[PDB]
From Swiss-Prot, chain A:
The chain holds residues 951 to 999 of 1273 of the full protein. Changing residue 4 to H: In strain: Omicron/BA.1, Omicron/BA.2, Omicron/BA.2.12.1, Omicron/BA.2.75, Omicron/BA.4, Omicron/BA.5, Omicron/BQ.1.1, Omicron/XBB.1.5, Omicron/EG.5.1. It comes from Severe acute respiratory syndrome coronavirus 2. Residues 1-43 form a coiled coil. This is Spike protein S2'. Changing residue 31 to F: In strain: Omicron/BA.1. Changing residue 32 to A: In strain: Alpha/B.1.1.7. Changing residue 19 to K: In strain: Omicron/BA.1, Omicron/BA.2, Omicron/BA.2.12.1, Omicron/BA.2.75, Omicron/BA.4, Omicron/BA.5, Omicron/BQ.1.1, Omicron/XBB.1.5, Omicron/EG.5.1. Subunit of the fusion protein that is processed upon entry into the host cell. Mediates fusion of the virion and cellular membranes by functioning as a class I viral fusion protein. Contains a viral fusion peptide that is unmasked after S2 cleavage. This cleavage can occur at the cell membrane by host TMPRSS2 or during endocytosis by host CSTL. In either case, this triggers an extensive and irreversible conformational change that leads to fusion of the viral envelope with the cellular cytoplasmic membrane, releasing viral genomic RNA into the host cell cytoplasm. It comes from the Viruses.
Amino acid sequence: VVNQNAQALNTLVKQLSSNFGAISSVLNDILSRLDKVEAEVQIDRLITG
Amino acid sequence: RVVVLSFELLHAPATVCGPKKSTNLVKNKCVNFNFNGLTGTGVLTESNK
């Protein structure tokens, strides 16, 4: 019961490192690189995933 | 005449950067930060790593 809940939280935290088809996993990097109109197209793929 | 400034971003330490001045270093307070284009918000503390 400890190991299952630890493994579920590790899987949840590792999923932040996924691109989900965006140019990056890192939200501040998208917002640092792109102006608003093009940034939000990348943000929506991170939100969905 | 054409010039094409290709550039690369994540893979390594920074090598080319913008002109904006480095601050004094704040410790043991919540701050935004930038070190060589690694950015975030956090408390910064004296390491032993």
